[PDB]
């Protein structure tokens, strides 16, 4: 089951080292700008989610009381996907045939401090179409799958799979890896500042406030 679930997971994963060090550095400077702007109060209420070791910045579309009861906000509640995201990031993904033109209407920047993390979850299937596309910046890390170990540590202490995520790499989740298994990130795998950009398409018939 474990080696067999790893196979099934790997089946729904795709990765490309798509961004040079130089491109990563250009995008990383822009990510810093977004942090500065948020701090100057320039963004709408629901654009910035601040947690202790994790800040999240929602563009294009955002989502919210009850587990798996995520609801989209009136678009207009979150800020526009900025121009540098479109041109530095989404354009390159469109160019290299990772996703089609017009797919993306949601870009979320997660900014991680050292020892930051994200607990076990599935990207909510009722809000987002598949595939989920993520691009990494500032440093290398790892994305874990099958995150039972975070909650039941006597029985188990390793994930079903651990996937390295390099600076400048693109990770694309679908089928089994996006739908039938959790993913998470461990504090121990974020040794220095990491940021990731998550590019998604919301469902038309996604539930809404």
Ligand X SMILES: O=C(O)CCC(=O)C(=O)O
Binding residues for ligand X, rule: CB under 6 A, are 110, 118, 123, 134, 143, 183, 185, 196, 198
Q: How far is CA 98 from the centre of its chain?
A: 16
**Residue 143, binding choice from Mn ion, ligand X, none, Cβ under 5 to 8 Å by partner class:** ligand X
Nearer to ligand X, 101 or 191 (CB): 191
Residue 123 found at the interface with Mn ion (CB under 5 A): yes
What are the catalytic residues?
63
Candidate ranges 4-12, 73-81, 118-126, 162-170; the one touching Mn ion (CB under 5 A): 118-126
Tell me the helix, strand and coil percentages in the chain, rounded to 5: 25, 30, 45
Pairing of the two strands 132-137 and 118-121: unpaired
> Both tokens of residue 16?
């490309």
For the chain, the straight-line distance linking the first and the last C-alpha, in angstroms and rounded, comes to 40
Helix (H, G, I), strand (E, B) or coil at 148: helix
Is position 63 an interface residue for Mn ion (rule: CB under 5 A)? Answer: no
The pair phi, psi for residue 189, each rounded to 5°, is -90, 0
The residues in 146-185 that bind Mn ion, with binding defined as CB under 5 A, are none
Q: How far is CA 104 from the centre of its chain?
A: 13
110 binds, among ligand X, Mn ion, none (CB under 5 to 8 A by kind): ligand X
Known binding-site residue numbers for 2-oxoglutarate: 110, 112, 121, 183, 194
Nearest-approach distance from CB 154 to ligand X, in angstroms: 26
Between 111 and 123, CB nearer to Mn ion = 123
């Amino acid at each position: 089951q474990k080696e067999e679930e790893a196979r099934k997971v790997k089946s729904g994963i795709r990765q490309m080292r798509l961004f040079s060090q130089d491109e990563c550095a250009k995008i990383e400077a822009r990510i810093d700008e977004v942090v500065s702007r948020a701090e100057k109060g320039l963004y709408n209420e629901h654009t910035v989610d601040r947690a202790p070791l994790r800040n999240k910045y929602f563009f294009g579309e955002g989502y919210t009381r009850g587990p798996g009861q995520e609801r989209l906000y009136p678009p207009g509640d979150v800020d526009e996907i900025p121009e540098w995201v479109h041109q530095l990031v989404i354009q390159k993904l469109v160019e290299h045939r990772v996703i089609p033109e017009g797919f993306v209407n949601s870009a979320v920047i997660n900014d991680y401090q050292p020892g930051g993390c994200i607990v076990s979850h599935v990207d909510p299937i009722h809000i987002f179409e598949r595939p989920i596309v993520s691009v990494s910046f500032f440093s290398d890390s790892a994305l874990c799958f099958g995150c039972k170990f975070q909650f039941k540590p006597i029985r188990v202490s390793e994930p079903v799979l651990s996937l390295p995520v390099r600076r400048g790499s693109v990770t694309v989740l679908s089928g089994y890896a996006a739908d039938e298994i959790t993913h998470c990130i461990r504090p121990q795998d974020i040794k220095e500042r990491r940021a990731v950009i998550i590019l998604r398409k919301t469902r038309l018939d996604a539930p809404r406030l």
